[PDB]
Ligand binder design. Structure first.
Ligand SMILES: [Fe+3]
Ligand SMILES: [Fe+3]
Ligand SMILES: [Fe+3]
Ligand SMILES: [Fe+3]
Lengths: 239, 271, 285, 248
């Protein structure tokens, strides 16, 4: 029995009733997957039994296993990872929250002229072992069919635009993505595990714990190559 | 009467020579002047020493229907507007009277009293600026609408891109009467306004004129903005303006401007 | 009665435990609460199931002088302000009532009725944001002044007519010296119309620049409300933001506000009232 | 007899009455120099006799000769920013090809006090991306006039100690004030024209409004000194060596 409890209007849900591990039924896995897609980031609590091997075994059921700043993970490659699982190991006595934003909700909220702009824009993403890729600013989510924004801090520029225009448009879209209403902010506790849809989110690791020691363990799941609204795929420039 | 046109810059501006400007010009001469205006956006006549207010107005009559001087600034029904340095310096990029539906199509401005230095006027081509837009920004402009106001309160929603009724060319319609873009947050209106205005006022899309006695400028207010430079300190400066009635902007899909407040019937007819 | 303070983040936020909040607390307890408030900027009490409007007000009385609810929104002379979702949602970064000279020093906000999801509130430290400024931007902030002013359904129009019934305009320094801590703090937020002596385009750019630094997630704490929760914040060293992420669900909190003093800039100059009179709203603390 | 005719309130003057060349009196040279410092860019006309050698001989009297559709000050990526340039028309397009200048002195005076002080305390990284990188003050004290002037333009990569987003916003704010039309003069070149500008108190912009018609002007540049800020601190070279370009 997988119960899903919404945390906010546009993003975030708690999951309850699941002892997380590699031995879950297909019904349970696909209910977890359904929640992930709908809510964008989901949180399990009380997973005291869970270790690295268990986290990995669990990850294997959801896909194929593989920063004080707003970003989507590893967008400087063509095959942007679809999701990540993050488990608390050692937490500071204060701070160390993480925030997520819905790039789906942000798109839906765009007025028509700005939607169409986003639909037609392409962005150069890089890691500066050099990677450079041109991604559409709007990609069609391969599992939900929903249109979602693809931006974040690996964006160097928008194709065909002056740098001053890239800066202004990037800020305009980012402002809409990171509006507090499109975000959820999680306070980590021991036994917590978060899973997010990296195709429909950005996130931000808040450095508000003064460099107290903090360890979480991440498993990342392979994704596909973004397709734009007209069927065009991302173009790898380097890497 | 030969009307010779000399280009001043790639995208905007021409001098006109060979015409004693007045109300007694042939249709061939008038339509050659009109053709130059549309192609070059602002045109300049010089040495018009004989020209007075009545002559300027008689000449204006041949190119269109003179407007009341201004919707709100006119003392009565007079067709001449004083551009007098004691009352204002329009030190800001704009298209004339865009807060009404019937944006005037053109203005004629004649030098009367000039400062010993400064007092230039600049014009920008809102046609060239559009052509220069990369495709995603063109389409954005094509789909944006702007609220223009004069704060007799006037408020009108115009398309950011209008199709020029005589040339068929697409041209930007912005300038300082824009309060906001319809449906957008104010921060987004500010950023996009600056983006488009930056492209309009790029020096390459502008011509800047040094006024001399006997000069007369005519500009296509559907395809330009202009700016009166206040670089003459406190010197007295007077030019006389006649404005010609225009039509209601139509966007790229055939939609017309939407009046929210005010009534311009008294200011001018629809041309 | 032990008052235990638990930090929530590096630059802002603490939980308070061990206090049954009310009007009958010892001076030691009150001053320990006050000390936590100044250090942590916003503090949170939980499990205050016994607490009602009268109790909240009795408690507020120990920490300062309650104001009239609001300069313009108050029906009369009542000290409680409804934060009611039918009338308004303050989905915007601000410091309370900065359009008067006597900016209230603090507010107490108690949960009454909560949505099943969302409805979080965030606070930012305008103290930490100042400390984090590089020297040239500090000196800029030190020398800037800002003009603050107060300018669908019937409930919503009422709210807005009432809010603006009288006009208020005041020039405040962008940096004020905190009268209890001595710390320099930014004073901005959404009542700012412009910066004195600057072009509007420059006011917009500088406002965004400073606000960006204030609202950086690192300088914020975001609270999930539960029944029995009560928040108290230092309105001299914060801004806050009511997040509208609960769709059309009903949400009510009750606010009591405490009288503050007139901001002084870094050179000893005080705020200059241009319009409005706040004598009726509150005294100067 | 050197007559100076103002072109605008804050910048620009025509010079008349001088056959420009290497054989001018000290009185004439220093009157030309005085006009340059006051007006920031000055224009001679009708100099049909003037050739490259003559332009250079004339330049020699005003300093030590050294040996862009975008607002800039020349060669600010070195410590020894050249003090001035002389530009003579050789071959002009039939239309367009204007040049504009802006006064970085007037722009400073016009700043409200808080923004002045900001400018007084800001430093900028200038580069040419032979890689050159130098940190210059945003406000320098002009060594001949004593007037404070802004030092920005398109070689600025960033402001020292600031986030890039802040550098972009402040750069645009100051540049907006510099290039305000009121602080500029725009010159229409004619054969026989020669312009001289004070590169310590200006920026300029070559307008590309002649569609790639052929256009030639000849430039001679005069060696300058190292900027000093409002507190006596000098520019800090991070990379490159300008000894070969010019002396101080
Ligand atoms: Fe990450
Ligand atoms: Fe005008
Ligand atoms: Fe509030
Ligand atoms: Fe140059």
């Amino acid at each position: 029995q997988v119960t899903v409890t919404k945390l906010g209007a546009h993003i975030g849900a708690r999951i309850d009733g699941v002892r997380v591990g590699g031995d879950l039924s297909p019904a349970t896995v696909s209910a977890i997957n359904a929640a992930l897609l709908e809510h964008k980031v989901i949180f399990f609590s009380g997973q005291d039994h869970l270790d690295d091997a268990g986290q990995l075994e669990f990850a294997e059921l959801l896909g194929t296993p593989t920063a004080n700043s707003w970003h989507t993970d590893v967008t400087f490659v063509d095959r942007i990872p679809k999701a990540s699982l993050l488990r608390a190991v050692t937490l500071p006595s204060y701070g160390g929250t993480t925030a997520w934003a819905s790039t789906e909700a942000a798109y839906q909220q765009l007025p028509a002229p700005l939607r169409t702009l986003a639909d037609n824009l392409w962005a150069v993403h890089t890691n500066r072992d050099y990677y450079e890729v041109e991604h559409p600013v709007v990609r069609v989510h391969p599992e939900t069919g929903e249109r979602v924004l693809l931006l974040g801090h690996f964006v160097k520029s928008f194709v065909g635009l002056k740098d001053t225009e890239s800066a202004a448009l990037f800020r305009l879209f980012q402002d809409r993505i990171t509006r507090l209403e499109n975000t959820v902010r999680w306070s980590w506790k021991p036994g917590d595990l978060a899973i997010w849809d990296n195709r429909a989110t950005q996130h931000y690791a808040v450095a508000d714990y003064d460099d107290q020691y903090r360890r979480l363990n991440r498993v990342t799941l392979a994704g596909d190559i973004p397709v734009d609204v007209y069927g065009e795929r991302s173009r790898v420039i380097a890497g």
